[PDB]
Every structure is written in C-alpha cells, then in structure tokens.
Amino acid sequence: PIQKCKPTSPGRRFVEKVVHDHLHKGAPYAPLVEAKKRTGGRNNNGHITTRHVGGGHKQHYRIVDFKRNKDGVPAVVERIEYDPSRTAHIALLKYADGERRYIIAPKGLRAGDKVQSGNDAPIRPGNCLPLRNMPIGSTLHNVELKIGKGAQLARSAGASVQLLGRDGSYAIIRLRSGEMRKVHVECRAVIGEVSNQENNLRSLGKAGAARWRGVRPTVRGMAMNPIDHPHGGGEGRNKGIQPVSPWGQKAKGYKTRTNKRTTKMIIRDRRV
Template identity: 55%
Template sequence: MAPLKKKGGGKQNGRITVRHRGGGHKRRYRIIDFVRDKHDIPAKVATMEYDPNRSARISLLHYADGEKRYILSPSGIKVGDVIFSGEKSDIKPGNALSLNKIPVGTMLHCVELRPGKGAKLGRSAGAAIQLMAKGDGMLSSNLGPVKSEK
C-alpha cells in the first residue's frame, strides 16, 4: 500500500482553484497487479477486501513462493480458492491466460489490449467483456454493460 495525496481543490502552490472540494476520509492506495505475470505459480486467495479507491472489490493473493499481490476480484471466487496465471491454467474464474486459449462466448474482465502491458478493459465493478470472435491475430469482443434483470 502507498499513501494517497489529497488535492483538496488546489494546485501545487496551495491556492484553492476549485471551491467546495477537499476533506473526506484518509485513504491508502492499494497497488493492484494488472499484469499477472507470475506464470505457473499457484496463488491462494487469502482475503477479499473493500478498496476505497475503486468500485470493485479486491483480493489478496498469497503465492507459493511467498509473494503477496492484490488483484481485482472476479465473481465466482472465494477465500481459500487456488488460482493460476499462464498458458497451462484452466478456464475458471480467477485464472489469467491469453485470449487465444479462451473459447468464444466466454465472459471476461481485466483484459489487456497488448500482451504484457496490463489490463485496460473491464476493470470497474460489474463490467464484463464477451469474447465474440477470433481469427488472424485479431479478436472481436462486446464491451457493452452487463444487466441482470429479474
């Protein structure tokens, strides 16, 4: 975690430029792993936590080599689950693998636009991306919002 500096409606010189801003509760910024580059190392979901800096819940992973990292929590995982990242991982919630290994029609979140550059799409709470088509190094996806009606 890192400290998060408050702007309070002012610039670097301290003069207020936007009125009625400021205050609020003190926050610490949780550093989220959007790259998921620890391939073929099992990670156990230790906790699922509230993050005041974003709308989605986050999960703390304990890797088998002793490292700890935060990720955005996908729906369908719970504390105690073991997840993987890499080419050999299964297609189940929490696992991270390349898009060419995922079947068409699968719902995704935290999708990278370019491999290794970090997740850019589907990062807010409730956001989902459906993989529509694959071919010739290009992928088609539906970025629309997901609605659940009763």
C-alpha cells in the same frame, strides 16, 4: 446484499447500504499499501482542472497486480478486502512460493480458492490467460489493450466483456458501453465478471455521504451570473440558450471524440 435503513432521522430514511459478510474486517496487507494524498482537482499550476473534487476520507492506495506476470505458479486466496480506491473488492493471493499480491476479485471468488496465470492456466474465474486461449463466448474482465501493460478495460465493480471471436491477430470483444472492439490476441484477460456487482444499488441518502466520497456540490449554470456561465443571467428562472458547458461546449448529444489514431480498432460503436 442491500440493507435499507430505518427512518430514525431524516438523514437516514433513504440510506440503502451494501453489506458483505465475507469481506476482511481488519487492516490491509501492510507491504502492499502506500500513501495516497488528495488533489482537490488541482494540477501542476495549482488551478482547478476538475470541478466538484475535494475533501473525503483519507485513503491508502492498495497495489493491485494488474499485469499478473507471475505465470505458472498457483496461488490461493487468503481473503477478500474492501478497497477504497475502486468500486470492486480485491483478493489477497498467497502464491505457492510465499509471495503475496493483490488482484481484482472475481464475482464468486472466496477465501481458499485457487487462481493461476499463463498459457496453461485452466479455465477458471480469476485465471489470467492470453486471448488466444480463451473460449469464444466467455465472460472476461481486466482486459489489456497494449501487450504487457496490464488490465485497463472492464475493471469496475460489475464489469465484464464478451469474447465474440478471434480472426487473425485480433479478437473481437464487446464492452459494457455496447461497443464492439478488437484487441490483439497477445493481450491478457481474466475469466469471469468483476466482484462487487451491487455497488450501483446503494443509496447515499444524504448530502454528507457524498461529501465523504470527496465530491463537492455542483452549481447549475442557470443559477450563475452571465460573467460566470453562458446560462447565467435572467430575471427569475430563464434558460433561453442551447445547453452548454461552462466553457461553451454543447451538452446534449454533441460528440467530442477526435482521436483518429485508434479509430480503425472500433468495429461498431454504441448508439448503433
């Protein structure tokens, strides 16, 4: 779980690290990793399009099987592994015919456990099933939105959705944001909650720890000049302005959703 560090120096006083004794200490499965170069938040044109991005440790991308399209074949868990690209752990499945794959690890999955996919799969954490065959009230993760595309929803370290009920060709689920949504019943989900789940109790402790994760420092617009930010200027400390983004969009409460194409799939949003 969480281990607090002794204050043997000022940069250690507040470092709360997450420690897991069951994670594989060793190299990732080599056929399933590829290179992942850093962007710095720069697009095609070479412009910065996302601020506060840059640096960080070199990372390989693990190829996680989000589609789980190997149905009917049982698989056994070989090990649980650190994945630098996400906040959850990953499980290395060895299928019954020798194929090795990566999946998002469920909360209680350990080495030696068995998972399966398809319509026939038993109700068991790590089993991928269409939303038709899931029992109401179940805790799911790794939920599809389009048929055949792969898990898109509830993938982060402690995520999960509630299956609230199916009516027609749409199951109604509740998301972590507090939002009630409908998803086609041919979409697949996985049983259980996502693995890591104390990822949000950690404490970085020092600035350099944030730099290791590829985050660059944030500068307040209050600290800038008027040519740089709409909050800039002023003798001394002044913020005589309704808070706003660097490009002039209001920052407290102003809603920015403008997609009209999928609004009929939202039963109840958050803030209700």
